[PDB]
Write a protein that binds this ligand. Sequence first.
Ligand SMILES: C=C1C[C@]23C[C@@]1(O)CCC2[C@@]12C=C[C@H](O)[C@@](C)(C(=O)O1)[C@H]2[C@@H]3C(=O)O
Lengths: 59, 338
Amino acid sequence: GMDELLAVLGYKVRSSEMADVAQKLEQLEVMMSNVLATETVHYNPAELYTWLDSMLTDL
Amino acid sequence: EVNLIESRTVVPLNTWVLISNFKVAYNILRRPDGTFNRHLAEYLDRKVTANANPVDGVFSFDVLIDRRINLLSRVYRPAYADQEQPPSILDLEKPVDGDIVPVILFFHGGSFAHSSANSAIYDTLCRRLVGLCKCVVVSVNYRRAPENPYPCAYDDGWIALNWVNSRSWLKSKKDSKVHIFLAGDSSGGNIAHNVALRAGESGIDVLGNILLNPMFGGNERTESEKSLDGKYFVTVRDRDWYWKAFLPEGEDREHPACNPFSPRGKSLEGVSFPKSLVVVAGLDLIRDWQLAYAEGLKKAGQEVKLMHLEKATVGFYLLPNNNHFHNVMDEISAFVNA
Ligand SMILES: C=C1C[C@]23C[C@@]1(O)CCC2[C@@]12C=C[C@H](O)[C@@](C)(C(=O)O1)[C@H]2[C@@H]3C(=O)O
């Protein structure tokens, strides 16, 4: 159920969660424009949903 | 202030997620003081190894072109016909079979600071080029700014061009010559232009250049830069940052490396330059510079084919889910096999 066009690019995202990932990306941009990289190195960069969710928390 | 609803209206949602993810990650990698978080950058980037095993009719292998600088390039080739076993390390340089076998020397994008030949987005693009153009692709892992600024990237491209041109196994049967085409997106397009200039001044004849949303600029703030700033993934602020990281200390954007048609740049009038295919995304904020580039070539009497995709954004060629990608791949094939 993963988006195969993103999977080939190294990213793992469920097709049904694409909109939720899009929402998180914008929420993260918002927080950045109101402000981190140290703790980022610990997160799995391929799992976008969890990566973004983890970043949002750190902010 | 932040509202990204507008950019979502022009691209498929998965494309939006891919480009926006890079946008946010790169914001973190670029530091206000001009430094770059290289360690995190290389950790976040999604990479893939070469693979001698044919996949979708394409296989690849890495080559060390120059040790002193550890310059690598990845070679992509169509699967060998009548292959009983996969290629061993001694079967990778098998002479190309065909009267005319185009070889595309590709330079990835990333504004001179991001990505590698082994980044998944570019390994995938190169594999698609091999299958859609029926040719060999050599992707250069050129050195990146700010650690290795101008002219390092161009020097790497020159070294790669000579390596390619001197491969006996890449010669076409017709004229016993290697049919070379330079290609690149973003900064890679800028590199292709500059490598082509150096080629003409030597004994290497490039058959054509393919520039996808080539990265060019100048001191002036064009109308597209002012009107599209921050609306479609790119900001003038980050553009300025990458130019400053790449250009020599104390230089400005009228340096020929930034603006190929700068008063400081050598005239292309009556010069031995290859035909060009220039693709310009209408929603790329540096659209005006790219259009000016295509016009510069035409004015200099050079052969130039302009593809202005008015509703396309940067990165439209990373996913095969839009007409811009399809139309462009069709023209690239026609261009290389013409
Ligand atoms: C800071 C940057 C770098 C971008 C522009 C951007 O504003 C945001 C996202 C970019 C990028 C990401 C991956 C591709 O390498 C690129 C060529 C693209 O299309 O989009 C990349 C593009 C580029 O290098 O031209």
